[PDB]
Amino acid sequence: EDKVEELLSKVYHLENEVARLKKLIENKKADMKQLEDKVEELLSKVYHLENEVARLKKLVGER
Amino acid sequence: EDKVEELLSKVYHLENEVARLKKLIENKKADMKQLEDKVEELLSKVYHLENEVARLKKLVGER
Amino acid sequence: EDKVEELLSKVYHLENEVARLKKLIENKKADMKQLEDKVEELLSKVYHLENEVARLKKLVGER
């Protein structure tokens, strides 16, 4: 093929691949956000358990 | 340089950079999957601790 | 427009979009690293709570 057609085809292929990757990145970003939310909730559930365990230790006099 | 050579070089550089980024995205996706698994396990370990703490509170009569 | 100008413009647009995506990927990688650290800490906080709960169960004789 002539070089101009070659180039047009390679550029179009790149445009489609960049679009596909941009959609994947976006999806990974949203997945990360959801995971970050779950980790923040886990941090709070753990802190609550730490306080409940401390209170049980005080009740039974465990140092 | 002539514009056709310029373009061919810029396109090749883009192809290599898009490949490199596609491999990075793929790697980030797999890392996310593994992390999601660890977070699901943490959710279960926390729920189990919540049940064990509740049962201890009942045993000692802690409201 | 002539095809050479067309191509130069499409290539420049691709270069800018690839740069933008590379910066997003990099940012997602660093966010993942920070999240992985928080998950490793959560794993340790959970293990510690499991040991504290086990010790409380032994103290009160709960099987």
Author numbering:
A (entry chain A), B (entry chain A), C (entry chain A): 5 to 67
Copy text verbatim from the article accompanying this structure deposition.
α-Helical coiled coils are ubiquitous protein domains, found in a wide range of structural and functional contexts. The structure of coiled coils is understood at a level unrivaled by any other fold. They consist of at least two α-helices, wound into superhelical bundles and held together by a mostly hydrophobic core. The seven positions in a heptad are labeled a – g, where positions a and d are oriented towards the core of the bundle and are thus mostly hydrophobic. We find that they indeed break the α-helices to form short β-strands, which associate into a triangular supersecondary structure we name the β-layer. β-Layers are found, also repetitively, in natural coiled coils, where they form regular fibers with alternating α- and β-structure, a protein fold that has not been described so far.
